[PDB]
Amino acid sequence: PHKSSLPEGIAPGTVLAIRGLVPPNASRFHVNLLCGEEQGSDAALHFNPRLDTSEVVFNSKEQGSWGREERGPGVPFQRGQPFEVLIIASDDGFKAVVGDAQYHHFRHRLPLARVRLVEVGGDVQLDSVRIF
Amino acid sequence: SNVPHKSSLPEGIAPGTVLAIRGLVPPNASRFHVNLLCGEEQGSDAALHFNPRLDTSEVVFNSKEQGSWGREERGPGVPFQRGQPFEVLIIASDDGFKAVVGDAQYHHFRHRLPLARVRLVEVGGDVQLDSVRIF
Ligand SMILES: OC[C@H]1O[C@@H](O[C@H]2[C@H](O)[C@@H](O)[C@H](O)O[C@@H]2CO)[C@H](O)[C@@H](O)[C@H]1O
C-alpha cells in the first residue's frame, strides 16, 4: 500500500498526480485521502475504480462507517491498459481527471484541512505518484 | 503548430484551477510564453507571463499592469530543451501560481494581480503545441 505522508496538510491548489497500469487480472484499486496516520482514520475521499463491477465509486468514511456512494459514468479504466489520473483540490471539492478529461466532481464532505495522508491500495501498478 | 493559442475563461479561474500544456520545443526555438491575461483586448494586464528562454537558458516570470511590466523573477535553470517534448502544469492556489515541469515543482510565483481578474490563457512563441487543457 503506497503511502505519501502530508503532515502539513493540503489546500485548494493541491494536485495529486498518479500514473500507472491496471494489471490484466485486477479486480479493483483505490486512492484514499485520509485524515491521519492511524489505522481507521477518516477518509475525506475514497476513489475506487472497480474493474470487476465496471464501476467507479467515490465515498467518504467517518468514524469507520462509509457514507453515500457516488459514481462517475461508466469506467475509464481497462485491465492491461495504462492510465493517468489527477485528483485536484479546490475550495468546493475534489476534481477527478482521468485520461485528460474531467471525470467527476466530489464535493467536500469532511474538511479538506483534515487530510494528512495519501494512500494508494488495491490491485494496481504505479509508475508515478506526485503531490504538487 | 497550434500557435498563437487562446483559451477564453470569461467566468474566471479560482484556486484549484490547473492549466496543463504539453508540446514540443522545436529544434531552433528561441523562447516561448504562456500568459494569463485579464481580458481579450490587446494590452490586457498579465497576471502571469511565463517565459522559457532557450536562447539565454533561463525562465522568466513576470506580470504587467496598465502596460507596465513588473520586476522579473527567474526559476532555477531552463527545464526545457530544443528537440524535446515537455509537460507543464500551471496550478492556481490562494497564494500564487505553481509551475510544474516534467513531474517536478519548478517555481512558485506569488500573486501580484488578483487571481479573480484572469479571463484568458494565451500560448505562443517558438513551440509546437500538443494540447492545452484547463481543469
Ligand atoms: O463505498 C465504499 C466502500 O465500498 C465497499 O463496497 C460496497 C459496494 O458498492 C457493494 O458491494 C455494496 O454497495 O456494498 C458495499 C458498501 O456497503 C468496499 O468493500 C469498501 O472497500 C469501499 O470501497
Swiss-Prot record, chain B:
**GO molecular function list:** carbohydrate binding
One GO cellular component term of this record is: cytoplasm
Key words, A-Z = Apoptosis, Cytoplasm, Lectin, Nucleus, Secreted
Enumerate the SUPFAM superfamilies for this protein.
Concanavalin A-like lectins/glucanases
Q: Specify whether Ubl conjugation is a keyword of the entry.
A: no
Q: Which domain of life is it from?
A: Eukaryota
The subunit field of the Swiss-Prot or TrEMBL record says:
Monomer.
Q: What is the protein name stated in its UniProt record? A: Galectin-7
Species assigned in the record:
Homo sapiens
Tell me the name of the encoding gene.
LGALS7
